[PDB]
Amino acid sequence: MNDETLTVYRGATDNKGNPNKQVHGTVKGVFAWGPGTSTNKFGRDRNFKGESSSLTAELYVKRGADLKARDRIRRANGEEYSVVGHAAWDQGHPFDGFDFGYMVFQVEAVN
Amino acid sequence: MNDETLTVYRGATDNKGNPNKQVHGTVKGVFAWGPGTSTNKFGRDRNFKGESSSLTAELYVKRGADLKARDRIRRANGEEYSVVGHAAWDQGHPFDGFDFGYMVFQVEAVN
Amino acid sequence: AGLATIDELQTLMSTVFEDDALEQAQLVLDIVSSWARVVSGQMWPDAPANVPDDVRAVVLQASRRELKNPDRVISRQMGPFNVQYSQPPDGFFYPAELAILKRFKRSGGLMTVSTSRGEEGRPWAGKTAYIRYGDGL
Amino acid sequence: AGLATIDELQTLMSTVFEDDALEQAQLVLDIVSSWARVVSGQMWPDAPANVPDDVRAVVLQASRRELKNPDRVISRQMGPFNVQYSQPPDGFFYPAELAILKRFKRSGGLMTVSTSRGEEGRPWAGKTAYIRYGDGL
Amino acid sequence: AGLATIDELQTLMSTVFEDDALEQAQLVLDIVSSWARVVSGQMWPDAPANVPDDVRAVVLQASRRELKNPDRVISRQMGPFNVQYSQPPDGFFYPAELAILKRFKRSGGLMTVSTSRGEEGRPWAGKTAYIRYGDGL
Amino acid sequence: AGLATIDELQTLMSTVFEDDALEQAQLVLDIVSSWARVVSGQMWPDAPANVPDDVRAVVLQASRRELKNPDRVISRQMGPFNVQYSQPPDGFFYPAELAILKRFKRSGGLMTVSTSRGEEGRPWAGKTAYIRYGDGL
Amino acid sequence: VKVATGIDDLSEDATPEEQQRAKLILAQDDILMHGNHEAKFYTLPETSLDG
Amino acid sequence: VKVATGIDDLSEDATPEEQQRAKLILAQDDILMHGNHEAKFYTLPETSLDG
């Protein structure tokens, strides 16, 4: 498939709140900017003295990939995303057991 | 079917608010992350000093299963959910009486 | 006396029948074996011993179809999960499986029925009024 | 005695069958091999040794189809994922694969059944009442 | 002994096969080569050397079809992405590709089977009872 | 030895082929050229020099179709973008393109296969037993 | 020549030697039958021999 | 001329030399059969020779 290399940052926030994030490695996934024939809308805080926008998208990645929740991913374009929640549809087909081979990750744009 | 073993925790909150939850047993059910061709979106409190996310999903389980409301379920993946509300469509078809054999539970991610 | 053992069915289906699921599977196997015996015309005395490999394959496939899809659904949709099965066989076997089972018939499946006009036939008539004149040998 | 080894199937499917998935794959291979032996009419004594390349290809393709799609679905949907398959073969092999297997039959598949009218036949009749007069040689 | 080298397939697909992808691609190429050898009727001794260009083209196209779409889907959907494919070929080659391969058979594909009535034939009969009278030359 | 140069293909597609894409385009051009040579029956010795204009056009169109749509899709959708293509050609060329390529065949494509009854033929028979009486000229 | 198409092939179980020609009885009274409804039975004409 | 169409081609396994002509027995009693139901058997007429 086409895919896209990303840079994962895995770490655990300690009791005091210090983010200890370091380059865990790489992962290949396909970005989806909408659930269908439309695109998600960028949002703004309206109380921030800046021009930062918020976007929530999806990342279709192969099942069993080295990506987890709270794992920041940076594309070659420079955009950075935060993986929110666990993987979705990381299961076989209930009727048969067929493995579609891909699981969708919800990613929130953080830049 | 493919199914999935879950660990149920049944208990009753007393008048003083002390949760008394113990391992009731196991149940097999299929997790649905959306009502159709889409996925439910994770949410955040935005007032909690942490990185906890909220999620509501469904758990298709066979009719007559040993699962009730306010019955926490833990998957083999370590994810924990709280069953909210009673079972839905735990009834025969009105026209015929046909039993599809499955009832859907609403589960809210608690981790 | 099923044409295929329950162990072969379990291996093919990658399951292990337990309690009530075992008697149902055995009944389905016996039913499919009866269908195969009638269609092929060969009553195998030792059902699991001398049964041919292709007959075992056909019986196993038919039994798996009957166990997994007994009510012969075309589609099934539960929430976000859907499945669309192809057209089920007319009885238990698809035309190819019926051809496999019918391979034990001779003359390519051609059968002839002998007809009669209802007349008995007396070839000895005419020779009845016969008197032996001579030495006699 | 399958017509293709499990290693070739693993290479074609780019997987490694383990634990119970190996016995199921071996059973599927044996079933497909029996079907191919019946259809082609050639009972290969040394199944993995002298089996032709195209027969191995047909067996491998049929085994992969049976393992990946045993229940012969046309569509599958799980959330945002979906897949639509083509019409499955009537039995195990598509018509092209059946033609490949049937290439071992002679006369282009033409078979003749000899008929009879039920009469035995006595060519020696008429010559029975023969007496030898002469020298005798 | 594939009819086309793996390097040609890599160039056509604009990819590089590594580790298990290489063995699967080689097996697919060998399978397609065996099918082409059977269909065309020509067993090329040196498979990559004297193979014709059109045969290589057909083999490469069929191998790419088998590698990219092994399960023969018509449509697959994943979120906002969807693709629909044309009807897959019956076996490995489309009718035009089958015609290209069948170009090595003479007489435009016409074949004749000679029949016999089962009679041996003795042309020397009648000449057997011959006695030579004369000088003898 | 493609029937059309890569520069003509680049001009037609309004693109410039780079590494890992120039080799693929050249391979596609060679494949289409081999197919055109087989269909037309004319093996052009100097492929880019004396090739006719319409043959170059057919090769260029087929190569563009193969490069832009290698997997022969009917539809493709990604988010708010969709495209629906016509039915792909059976092989490489549409029937009009096949007719254009076949224009080099004579007698409107009519071909005759000479048959024989298997008999050798001895026209000199009868004249063998001939003795020359006379002067001799 | 009596011709049959669409009959159940693969029969006679890999047709052997040692007789095995049951020689299906087709007399004047017999009615030839086949279970398949797609099967077709017909004959090919013969040469006149008068020419 | 007896003509057969739709038969299983690719047969005889790359038809060799050294006899290999089994010479399918087609006598007066034989019934010619083919498994494929799309196969067609027919004959091409012959010249009259009277003219």
* DSSP of E107-134: GGG-----EE-S----TTTTTSS----S
- Phi-psi region at F32: left, alpha or beta (left = phi > 0; alpha = psi -120 to 50): alpha
Tokens of B19: 């949760």
Contact A60 E78 (CB under 8 A): yes
Chain A, chain E: beta-carbon pairs less than 8 Å apart:
18
C-alpha C54/C-alpha C20 separation (Å) is: 29
Asked if the C-beta of D79 comes within 8 angstroms of chain B's C-beta atoms, the answer is yes
- Chosen for mutation from D73, D82, D111, D115 (greatest number of chain E CBs closer than 10 Å) is D82
Contacts of E116 in chain H (CB under 8 A): 23-26
In angstroms, what separates the C-alpha of A104 from chain C's closest C-alpha? Answer: 15
Q: Measure the CA–CA gap between B72 and D30, rounded to whole angstroms.
A: 47
Instruction: Put residue D86 in one of left, alpha, beta given phi > 0 → left and psi -120 to 50 → alpha.
Output: beta
Query: Would strands B102-109 and B5-11 be described as parallel, antiparallel, or unpaired?
Result: unpaired
Q: How far apart are CA D58 and CA E39, in angstroms?
A: 14
Contact H9, E111 (CB under 8 A): yes
Q: Which residues pair with B31 in a beta bridge?
A: B59
Cβ distance of D76 and A98 shorter than 8 Å: yes
Tokens in use for C91?
Answer: 């009885």
Residue reference for tokens 């070839």: C123
**SS3 state at C135:** coil
The rounded Cα C53 to chain-centroid distance in angstroms is: 14
H14 to E43: CB separation less than 8 angstroms, yes or no: yes
Helix axes F22-40, E53-68, angle to 10 degrees: 120
**Chains in contact with C, where contact requires at least 3 CB pairs less than 8 Å apart:** A, B, D, G, H
The answer to whether D63 and D8 have CB atoms below 8 angstroms apart is no
Between D20-40 and C6-13, two packed helices, what is the crossing angle to 10 degrees?
110
Tell me which chain C residue has its CA closest to the CA of residue D91: C96
- Ramachandran category for residue H12: left, alpha or beta (phi over 0 → left; psi -120 to 50 → alpha): left
Locate the chain F residue with the closest alpha carbon to A33: F79
Chain A interface includes E79 (CB < 8 A)? yes
User: In whole angstroms, what is the distance from residue D116 CA to residue D121 CA?
Assistant: 11
Chain A residues touching F80 at Cβ < 8 A: 34, 37-39
- What are phi and psi for residue G22, nearest 5 degrees? -60, -20
Residues of A in contact with F82 (CB under 8 A): 37
Residue B29 bridge partners (DSSP): B61
* Resolution to one decimal, Å: 3.7
Looking up tokens 């499919």 gives: C32
Pairing of strands H24-25, E115-116: parallel
Residue numbers in D near B32 (CB within 8 A): 79
Which one, of B22, B3, B11, lies nearest residue B75 by Cα?
A: B3
Backbone angles phi, psi at E35, to 5 degrees: -60, -40
Which residues of E, range 93-112, sit inside 8 Å of D by Cβ?
111
What's at D40, amino acid-wise?
S
Does chain B reach chain H with at least 3 CB pairs under 8 Å?
Answer: no
CA atoms of E30 and E20, how far apart (whole Å): 16
Instruction: Compute CA F87 distance to the chain's CA centroid, rounded to the nearest angstrom.
Output: 21
Q: State which residue of chain A sits closest to F80, comparing Cα positions.
A: A37
The answer to whether the Cβ–Cβ distance between G10 and C99 falls below 8 Å is yes
- Provide the residue count of chain G: 51
Q: Which of D104, D115, D116 sits opposite H13 (nearest CB)?
A: D104
Pairwise CB contact (< 8 Å): G4 & H34? yes
Method: cryo-EM
Distance CA F5, CA F22 (A): 12
Contact assignment for D115 to H29 by CB distance below 8 Å = yes
Count of alpha carbons within 13 Å of F66, Cβ hemisphere only? Answer: 30
| Chain C residues with a Cβ under 8 Å from any Cβ in chain H | 108, 110
CA dist., res. C23 & res. E21, Å (int)? 45
Chains in contact with E, where contact requires at least 3 CB pairs less than 8 Å apart: A, D, F, H
A82 to A8, A85, D44: CA distances (angstroms): 10, 10, 60
d(CA H6, CA G39) in angstroms, rounded, equals 15
| Inter-chain touch H27–E109, beta carbons under 8 Å | no
Of D41, D43, D115, the CB nearest to G26: D115
Neighbours of A32 (CB within 10 A): 23
Q: Give the separation between CA E115 and CA H41, rounded to whole angstroms.
A: 15
How far apart are alpha carbons B7 and B27 in whole angstroms?
7
Side-chain-side CA neighbours of F133 within 13 Å: the count stands at: 3
